[PDB]
Amino acid sequence: NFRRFFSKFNVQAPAVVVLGGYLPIGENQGVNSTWYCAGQHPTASGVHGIFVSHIRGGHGFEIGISQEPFDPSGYQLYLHKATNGNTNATARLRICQFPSIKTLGPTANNDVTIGRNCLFNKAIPAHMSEHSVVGITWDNDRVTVFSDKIYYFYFKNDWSRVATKCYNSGGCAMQYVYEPTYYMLNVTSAGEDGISYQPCTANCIGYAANVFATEPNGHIPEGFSFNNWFLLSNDSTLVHGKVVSNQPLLVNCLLAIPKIYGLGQFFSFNQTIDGVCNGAAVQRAPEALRFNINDTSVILAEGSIVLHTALGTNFSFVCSNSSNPHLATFAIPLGATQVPYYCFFKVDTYNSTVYKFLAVLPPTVREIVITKYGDVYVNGFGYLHLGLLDAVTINFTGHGTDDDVSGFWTIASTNFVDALIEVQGTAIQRILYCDDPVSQLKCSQVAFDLDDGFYPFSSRNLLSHEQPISFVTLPSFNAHSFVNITVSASFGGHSGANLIASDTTINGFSSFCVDTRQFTISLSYNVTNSYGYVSNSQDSNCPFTLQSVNDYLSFSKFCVSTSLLASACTIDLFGYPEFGSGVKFTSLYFQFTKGELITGTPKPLEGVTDVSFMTLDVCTKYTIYGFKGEGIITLTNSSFLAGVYYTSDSGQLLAFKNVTSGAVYSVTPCSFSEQAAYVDDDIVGVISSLSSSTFNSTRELPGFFYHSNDGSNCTEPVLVYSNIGVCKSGSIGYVPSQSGQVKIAPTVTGNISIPTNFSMSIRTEYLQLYNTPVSVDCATYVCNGNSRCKQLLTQYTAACKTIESALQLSARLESVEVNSMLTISEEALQLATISSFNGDGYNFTNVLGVSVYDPARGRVVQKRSFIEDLLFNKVVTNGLGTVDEDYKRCSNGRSVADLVCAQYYSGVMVLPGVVDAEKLHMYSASLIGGMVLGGFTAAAALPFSYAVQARLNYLALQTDVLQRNQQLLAESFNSAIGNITSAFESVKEASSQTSRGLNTVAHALTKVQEVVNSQGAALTQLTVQLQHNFQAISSSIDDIYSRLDPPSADVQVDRLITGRLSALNAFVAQTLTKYTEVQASRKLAQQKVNECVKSQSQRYGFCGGDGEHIFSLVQAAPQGLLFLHTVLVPSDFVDVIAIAGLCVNDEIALTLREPGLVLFTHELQNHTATEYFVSSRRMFEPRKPTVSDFVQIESCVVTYVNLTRDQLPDVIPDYIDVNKTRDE
Ligand SMILES: *[C@@H]1O[C@H](CO)[C@@H](O[C@@H]2O[C@H](CO)[C@@H](O[C@@H]3O[C@H](CO[C@H]4O[C@H](CO)[C@@H](O)[C@H](O)[C@@H]4O)[C@@H](O)[C@H](O[C@H]4O[C@H](CO)[C@@H](O)[C@H](O)[C@@H]4O)[C@@H]3O)[C@H](O)[C@H]2NC(C)=O)[C@H](O)[C@H]1NC(C)=O
Ligand SMILES: *[C@@H]1O[C@H](CO[C@@H]2O[C@@H](C)[C@@H](O)[C@@H](O)[C@@H]2O)[C@@H](O[C@@H]2O[C@H](CO)[C@@H](O[C@@H]3O[C@H](CO)[C@@H](O)[C@H](O)[C@@H]3O)[C@H](O)[C@H]2NC(C)=O)[C@H](O)[C@H]1NC(C)=O
Ligand SMILES: *[C@@H]1O[C@H](CO)[C@@H](O[C@@H]2O[C@H](CO)[C@@H](O[C@@H]3O[C@H](CO)[C@@H](O)[C@H](O)[C@@H]3O)[C@H](O)[C@H]2NC(C)=O)[C@H](O)[C@H]1NC(C)=O
Ligand SMILES: *[C@@H]1O[C@H](CO)[C@@H](O[C@@H]2O[C@H](CO)[C@@H](O[C@@H]3O[C@H](CO)[C@@H](O)[C@H](O)[C@@H]3O)[C@H](O)[C@H]2NC(C)=O)[C@H](O)[C@H]1NC(C)=O
Ligand SMILES: *[C@@H]1O[C@H](CO)[C@@H](O[C@@H]2O[C@H](CO)[C@@H](O[C@@H]3O[C@H](CO)[C@@H](O)[C@H](O)[C@@H]3O)[C@H](O)[C@H]2NC(C)=O)[C@H](O)[C@H]1NC(C)=O
Ligand SMILES: *[C@@H]1O[C@H](CO)[C@@H](O[C@@H]2O[C@H](CO)[C@@H](O[C@@H]3O[C@H](CO)[C@@H](O)[C@H](O)[C@@H]3O)[C@H](O)[C@H]2NC(C)=O)[C@H](O)[C@H]1NC(C)=O
Ligand SMILES: *[C@@H]1O[C@H](CO[C@@H]2O[C@@H](C)[C@@H](O)[C@@H](O)[C@@H]2O)[C@@H](O[C@@H]2O[C@H](CO)[C@@H](O)[C@H](O)[C@H]2NC(C)=O)[C@H](O)[C@H]1NC(C)=O
Ligand SMILES: *[C@@H]1O[C@H](CO)[C@@H](O[C@@H]2O[C@H](CO)[C@@H](O)[C@H](O)[C@H]2NC(C)=O)[C@H](O)[C@H]1NC(C)=O
Ligand SMILES: *[C@@H]1O[C@H](CO)[C@@H](O[C@@H]2O[C@H](CO)[C@@H](O)[C@H](O)[C@H]2NC(C)=O)[C@H](O)[C@H]1NC(C)=O
Ligand SMILES: *[C@@H]1O[C@H](CO)[C@@H](O[C@@H]2O[C@H](CO)[C@@H](O)[C@H](O)[C@H]2NC(C)=O)[C@H](O)[C@H]1NC(C)=O
Ligand SMILES: *[C@@H]1O[C@H](CO)[C@@H](O[C@@H]2O[C@H](CO)[C@@H](O)[C@H](O)[C@H]2NC(C)=O)[C@H](O)[C@H]1NC(C)=O
Ligand SMILES: *[C@@H]1O[C@H](CO)[C@@H](O[C@@H]2O[C@H](CO)[C@@H](O)[C@H](O)[C@H]2NC(C)=O)[C@H](O)[C@H]1NC(C)=O
Ligand SMILES: *[C@@H]1O[C@H](CO[C@@H]2O[C@@H](C)[C@@H](O)[C@@H](O)[C@@H]2O)[C@@H](O)[C@H](O)[C@H]1NC(C)=O
Ligand SMILES: *[C@@H]1O[C@H](CO[C@@H]2O[C@@H](C)[C@@H](O)[C@@H](O)[C@@H]2O)[C@@H](O)[C@H](O)[C@H]1NC(C)=O
Ligand SMILES: *[C@@H]1O[C@H](CO)[C@@H](O)[C@H](O)[C@H]1NC(C)=O
Ligand SMILES: *[C@@H]1O[C@H](CO)[C@@H](O)[C@H](O)[C@H]1NC(C)=O
Ligand SMILES: *[C@@H]1O[C@H](CO)[C@@H](O)[C@H](O)[C@H]1NC(C)=O
Ligand SMILES: *[C@@H]1O[C@H](CO)[C@@H](O)[C@H](O)[C@H]1NC(C)=O
Ligand SMILES: *[C@@H]1O[C@H](CO)[C@@H](O)[C@H](O)[C@H]1NC(C)=O
Ligand SMILES: *[C@@H]1O[C@H](CO)[C@@H](O)[C@H](O)[C@H]1NC(C)=O
């Protein structure tokens, strides 16, 4: 049955869900089964769960669970109900240090006494329905019981050994479970019905929406819900947008755990975490670990989170409703999510125990995340920080037992990575890792999809920085000095025991001070004794001696004095004559202050120079003659003589000269700019200045290198740039000069080729007509509504006023121009629908839009055409133009502002477009109906074939209007229209867009995309400027006025006022450029529609390029018109001999009146019968000549054909020989 058992996992009726854990293994499917249903007592080891499925009224039931080591100290379990009283027969249950019953019995053969120690020795009612299933599972010291509810109990245990006694119940009474299993619930109704449980394989684990299969590279697989995966911040959370941020999303191992189980686990930031990873595990030590949980009740237990620091300090996670652990108890007396819970960290160390306040716990904790460097986030916020973590222990307590295992609560080991994240409604929906060079380029911009084009790129530098340090500078000459000392003493006198005189000097002076870095002392000994010699000895009462100082003694100041000297240590000298007078010389003093300015040296080193050092041809940091930088130093073989360092005219260092050797070394950048040809959502080639890169082929273009994976010629350039083009396959090549359509130069004689076999092609061209008007509330944009800032802005006079006036004047001028342009005729509109139109042979179903009764306020509306549908839906990012938000609700303030209201709060209001797509399509339909309207009334609806025939006759008089002649043009036009429609439908498929370039569909759609993106880009660029702090103390005016005094604050806010005003002016200037450019576009469009659509043009090449223009039809397009100029292209040429004229009887010269008419001889009778035909030079329409087409000239010329009077009527059938007729 099992319906009642699975009904306990309370789940919503219409939800299909996945079950995991030690569940019943069924009866028939898989190995599983093993339903005993007998008193055979199978003793088993290593079992993790047991189940009983059918209670045949009241049959008995005996269970004994014990440790396999049979430990008497450990706790055993024995449950026994050998009674059939149902409700009144409560089962005797004992979780105790209990008799370890080996086989069977209430007491039985065993160890341990009955009641030496018990945790539970009461009786429990064990009555239930026949189909009710009871089960008990033990794992990780946690026990789950299925007695009508998912009861959970933490209990240290090791319960591998089981012994049983069953009683017969339907052949499926009792069974064991060794390993976890999985199930699928097709729940369709509440209660025990509408459950439809089935067993599962591993795939069902992947079915849960909150778990995923980790990629081998660690990337998050696509399509993940990210239902609770918040982005991690310290300060504030973005509500909507895209962010390139460093977040711990590089997942290594994912541990999906069913909600009904708690968890006792140990995690180390230094070792790969254990457990069965769902996807491809990566053996990398975690630096962050993220817990995704449904309900808060898991964490409320004290000690659930224990953080271990490298210092050994422990942080225990505690919660209560109280804010004073030191002044109150935290044993929880309340539950059921009542009252917000203050949650702290208690610090555990045997010096002083303190509590660190985490936060008021939010009502719904969904993900916690702890990470090394000492950081913890709850619901993606930086609540608290600590020192370097090294280990965590997780002690989690199941779930709320009211909606369980509708999936799995999951723990993820993650490493930090720079990723692009798209977030809406403060919830992540998609992510992109910034490791692939293609992904690196994507993250360089801010977008997930990138249009085809050449993008700037940085040359890949060294993976390991390890940059050596370079330093070049010629130093000063190492000046030396000799500090003389000379003592002059004439002693002895009489008998040698007397004195005569004594004196001493340093450098001929009574005092001296050392200046050079290197000094050497030298002492000299005038002692002249009248009796003989004198022994001289040196005393010392200083931390140094005259002999010691020379070695390496260093000072900041050193002065020698023969007399009193400030702060000077004393040194004396003794002179003993031959009989020992024993008198000192003059006392000597050193004033010394320690320092590196000077140093005592035993020998001078004059000539010693140079301390520079550098590394050649290695990307290194350098300090060259005061220029600090980072680059590559390379010995260059130039021969500069003057100068020591060389810089460009812009002040940039280029080369420096080793003065000692004369060599010169150039300094180049470590990395060079490159171009990536991002087409077809891939990097197909790189234009680089380097010799080689990570591509299979490299081609040496005249100006640069091109590295790609396709060395073949690029005959079909998908993306053209400068002098080159790149195909979709990565090939590069020069664009071949396409040969234009040949035009026959008119002439009077010789051969002439007349075009024929005309094929009716169509060429497309898009022309923008208007831009969306934008009003900028300058005052509130700059001052953010601050009155003081407005008063300061008043000092800037009329810049703001001019900005606003220019914007509004441009908007009004554009509006009035486009409004006066659009003229719509209702009679033409009547003929503009499929039912009214009769395009015999011409297939306008793609061009005409259907018109049906609109339930929206009754008024009838005409749906836009299929071509217009394709052009709008697939291009417009919002799908429809009505998506333009209204500011009516923007000031409501009851909801969090979106992007439109975000920019409106800055004073930017985007007025609706001047003309909606509905009116534009109406105008296009009016033009289409007008080109077939043959009169002032609707009854004059000329068939399109007649109109085409008239327009053809306009440029060349048709001589034989064959039905097949018109049918060929009709079918060619239909084929071209179908091809254009297919090209619009999709890119490079079902219509090969290999034929690409100007005047094609692809160019038009690229222009439309650029048009629809430019305005949004400009608006976002304007809005982001508010974030910038323009060299002020902050980007908030109120913050500046708070932290600063009024004097300095005015100076400070004046900095951003100029910055915002300058940024605002830049936006206005670029919009005026856009307005000026589009103005010329609509002037061309107005000229185009008048001279091409409403009437055929004699201006060759004006309407849709070269060729003979027959007509042109307009379709609506985003902020513009798409002209389809239909043009005739010749397919064959008839070669004829032009007749310059006739000279008949050598006396009458007769020529053709019409300059655009040629007289010739063709076909079999060009020379056999010498028959003449006149035809238009534009189209081959041979016709017999007429007397009205000829004029007489006063003189013949040699180029004219000889003729006689009798022969002329053969040439001219309409001629009447008046002399012959009158004389007969
Ligand atoms: C919320 O606010 C907290 C407050 O600190 C921020 O916590 C900091 O997080 C950053 C990482 O985001 C920590 O920086 C890490 O330092 C590690 C050790 O530092 C040494 O190495 C760096 C780099 O050589 C030296 O500059 C530094 O002086 C030390 O010598 C680094 O090894 C880490 O590098 C890792 O990331 C880089 C990418 O940036 C990889 O290339 C590396 O291979 C490596 O995987 C890292 O930079 C910082 O220590 C944390 N603060 C403190 C006080 O410890 C949170 O980041 C912030 N939240 C968000 C979302 O930003
Ligand atoms: C999960 O459950 C839904 C709900 O259907 C219910 O559960 C099933 C297990 C069956 O017991 C159903 O009888 C029960 O109502 C399943 O949706 C059901 O799918 C089946 C086919 O897979 C649908 O049958 C089809 O119905 C159409 C329209 O009547 C017929 O033309 C077909 O020939 C075929 O009979 C059934 O209509 C549909 N239930 C409803 C209410 O529309 C679902 O398949 C199942 N599994 C999953 C993965 O969702
Ligand atoms: C993991 O969390 C669980 C539950 O939060 C912890 O189990 C709990 O441990 C405390 C500490 O002894 C127990 O308190 C004691 O309860 C008994 C009654 O059973 C009482 O007589 C004692 O005076 C004392 O208050 C608590 O009962 C116990 N909870 C359960 C359900 O058994 C466990 O210690 C935590 N483990 C780690 C490693 O943090
Ligand atoms: C755990 O996840 C579940 C969803 O997987 C969420 O709780 C459940 O939310 C639904 C819809 O809000 C509740 O449905 C209805 O709730 C009432 C409450 O009395 C119930 O009586 C109705 O029959 C109906 O099922 C569902 O009860 C609820 N589950 C609970 C409360 O256990 C939520 O994301 C998480 N639940 C908690 C308590 O955090
Ligand atoms: C700039 O040019 C000068 C001039 O060549 C370079 O000086 C050179 O420096 C090296 C390293 O000190 C000298 O090598 C010598 O080796 C012998 C044997 O080990 C040792 O006894 C010397 O004391 C010295 O180290 C080399 O002779 C010397 N060249 C000379 C003196 O002409 C210098 O390295 C260049 N680069 C700079 C300054 O960055
Ligand atoms: C176009 O104009 C040229 C000259 O103005 C016409 O000349 C034709 O040229 C072809 C090619 O040489 C001649 O065919 C062969 O000529 C050679 C040399 O004269 C000779 O062996 C044969 O007579 C042979 O047919 C052709 O005779 C010559 N015809 C005339 C009237 O000059 C040419 O007819 C004009 N039309 C076309 C379609 O080229
Ligand atoms: C057409 O006639 C002109 C006029 O010349 C007269 O008619 C000729 C049929 C012949 O009888 C001439 O003697 C007549 O004077 C021709 O022009 C002459 O062409 C030749 C050919 O080389 C030339 O030598 C003469 O100078 C031309 N006479 C002029 C220019 O007065 C012409 O050749 C005749 N044929 C064609 C096809 O035009
Ligand atoms: C801080 O926590 C660590 C746990 O990581 C404690 O180390 C434990 O000490 C007990 C001593 O009774 C040992 O039985 C455990 O084996 C130790 N744990 C580990 C993982 O080895 C440490 O004593 C705690 N210190 C303080 C001051 O609370
Ligand atoms: C007094 O100072 C002079 C000045 O240098 C010292 O003379 C030097 O003596 C050394 C020792 O041989 C010579 O190598 C130098 O060439 C001498 N230099 C000069 C400029 O003469 C002298 O030694 C010091 N002492 C006395 C007693 O004169
Ligand atoms: C050029 O680069 C490609 C890219 O791997 C190398 O092989 C290509 O492999 C794909 C996939 O098997 C094939 O479809 C292509 O036909 C292969 N060639 C090309 C040019 O893409 C190739 O080994 C590289 N080196 C060369 C062609 O010399
Ligand atoms: C393909 O691209 C190459 C590279 O520019 C072109 O180079 C030609 O190579 C041939 C073979 O030696 C030379 O004879 C030509 O002089 C080269 N021309 C140029 C402009 O470089 C080549 O023309 C292109 N087309 C083909 C079919 O190889
Ligand atoms: C005329 O052009 C229309 C285009 O609207 C063609 O009609 C569509 O043909 C496709 C063929 O795959 C059908 O799937 C559509 O249901 C047709 N109707 C539409 C798109 O409205 C038509 O085949 C062309 N030729 C005619 C009418 O002779
Ligand atoms: C801490 O880790 C050191 C580095 O060894 C490896 O570290 C990470 C990257 C894992 O791959 C881990 O399995 C390796 O051991 C060890 O040298 C050091 O012994 C480790 N310290 C402790 C206490 O385990
Ligand atoms: C925290 O929650 C307590 C709820 O428990 C109830 O009150 C205690 C005193 C016991 O009597 C217990 O049996 C009750 O169910 C509140 O009483 C307590 O005031 C709360 N703490 C604070 C600071 O408000
Ligand atoms: C259980 O036994 C008592 C004693 O005879 C009796 O009164 C009671 O009705 C019984 N309960 C059931 C459910 O049979
Ligand atoms: C207590 O502080 C002293 C400070 O010298 C330190 O040496 C000692 O290890 C600390 N004791 C503990 C248990 O942290
Ligand atoms: C000391 O030596 C100096 C060296 O110049 C000499 O001139 C002088 O006569 C000597 N005797 C005395 C007493 O100075
Ligand atoms: C010095 O000149 C030679 C001339 O053959 C040249 O090959 C060499 O590259 C030059 N040195 C450097 C560093 O370029
Ligand atoms: C094309 O022109 C040739 C001669 O110029 C003619 O014979 C043919 O009928 C025309 N049409 C087609 C379809 O070839
Ligand atoms: C596209 O043009 C070719 C050549 O004119 C024609 O054969 C083909 O039928 C056209 N495609 C469609 C869909 O009409």
Short mmCIF file of N, CA and C in Angstrom, two decimals, residues 201-232:
data_model
loop_
_atom_site.label_atom_id
_atom_site.label_comp_id
_atom_site.label_asym_id
_atom_site.label_seq_id
_atom_site.Cartn_x
_atom_site.Cartn_y
_atom_site.Cartn_z
N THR A 201 15.85 5.62 -9.70
CA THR A 201 17.27 5.44 -9.94
C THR A 201 17.95 6.78 -9.65
N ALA A 202 19.26 6.87 -9.92
CA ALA A 202 20.01 8.08 -9.59
C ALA A 202 19.43 9.32 -10.26
N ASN A 203 18.78 9.16 -11.42
CA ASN A 203 18.29 10.31 -12.16
C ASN A 203 17.33 11.16 -11.34
N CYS A 204 16.53 10.53 -10.47
CA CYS A 204 15.58 11.29 -9.67
C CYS A 204 16.28 12.30 -8.76
N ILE A 205 17.51 12.01 -8.33
CA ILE A 205 18.25 13.00 -7.55
C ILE A 205 18.46 14.27 -8.37
N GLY A 206 18.79 14.11 -9.65
CA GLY A 206 18.89 15.27 -10.52
C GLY A 206 17.58 15.96 -10.80
N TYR A 207 16.45 15.34 -10.43
CA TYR A 207 15.16 15.94 -10.72
C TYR A 207 14.85 17.12 -9.80
N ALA A 208 15.38 17.11 -8.58
CA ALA A 208 15.08 18.18 -7.64
C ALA A 208 15.61 19.51 -8.16
N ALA A 209 14.81 20.57 -7.97
CA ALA A 209 15.14 21.87 -8.52
C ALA A 209 16.24 22.59 -7.76
N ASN A 210 16.51 22.20 -6.51
CA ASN A 210 17.49 22.88 -5.68
C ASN A 210 18.82 22.13 -5.59
N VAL A 211 19.02 21.10 -6.42
CA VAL A 211 20.28 20.40 -6.49
C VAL A 211 20.68 20.28 -7.96
N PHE A 212 21.96 19.98 -8.18
CA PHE A 212 22.51 19.98 -9.52
C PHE A 212 23.69 19.02 -9.58
N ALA A 213 24.08 18.68 -10.81
CA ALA A 213 25.24 17.84 -11.06
C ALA A 213 26.43 18.74 -11.37
N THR A 214 27.41 18.76 -10.49
CA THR A 214 28.57 19.63 -10.67
C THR A 214 29.36 19.21 -11.90
N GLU A 215 29.75 20.19 -12.71
CA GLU A 215 30.56 19.93 -13.88
C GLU A 215 31.96 19.49 -13.46
N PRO A 216 32.66 18.74 -14.32
CA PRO A 216 34.03 18.33 -13.97
C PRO A 216 34.95 19.50 -13.71
N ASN A 217 34.74 20.63 -14.38
CA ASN A 217 35.54 21.83 -14.14
C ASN A 217 35.03 22.64 -12.96
N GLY A 218 33.95 22.21 -12.31
CA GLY A 218 33.42 22.90 -11.16
C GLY A 218 32.38 23.95 -11.46
N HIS A 219 32.08 24.21 -12.72
CA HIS A 219 31.09 25.21 -13.07
C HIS A 219 29.69 24.75 -12.67
N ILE A 220 28.84 25.71 -12.34
CA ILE A 220 27.43 25.41 -12.08
C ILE A 220 26.76 25.03 -13.40
N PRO A 221 26.08 23.89 -13.48
CA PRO A 221 25.41 23.53 -14.73
C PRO A 221 24.30 24.51 -15.06
N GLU A 222 24.07 24.68 -16.36
CA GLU A 222 23.05 25.61 -16.82
C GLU A 222 21.66 25.12 -16.44
N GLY A 223 20.73 26.06 -16.33
CA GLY A 223 19.36 25.74 -15.97
C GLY A 223 19.10 25.62 -14.49
N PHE A 224 20.10 25.83 -13.64
CA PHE A 224 19.88 25.79 -12.21
C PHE A 224 18.94 26.92 -11.80
N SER A 225 18.09 26.64 -10.82
CA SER A 225 17.07 27.61 -10.42
C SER A 225 17.69 28.79 -9.68
N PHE A 226 18.70 28.53 -8.85
CA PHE A 226 19.22 29.54 -7.92
C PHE A 226 18.10 30.11 -7.07
N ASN A 227 17.24 29.21 -6.57
CA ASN A 227 16.04 29.65 -5.86
C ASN A 227 16.40 30.44 -4.60
N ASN A 228 17.41 30.00 -3.87
CA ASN A 228 17.84 30.70 -2.67
C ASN A 228 19.28 31.17 -2.71
N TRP A 229 19.98 30.94 -3.82
CA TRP A 229 21.40 31.28 -3.92
C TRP A 229 21.55 32.79 -4.08
N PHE A 230 21.59 33.48 -2.94
CA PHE A 230 21.76 34.92 -2.96
C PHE A 230 23.20 35.30 -3.26
N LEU A 231 23.38 36.44 -3.92
CA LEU A 231 24.72 36.99 -4.08
C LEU A 231 25.19 37.57 -2.75
N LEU A 232 26.50 37.52 -2.53
CA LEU A 232 27.08 37.82 -1.23
C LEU A 232 27.65 39.23 -1.22
#
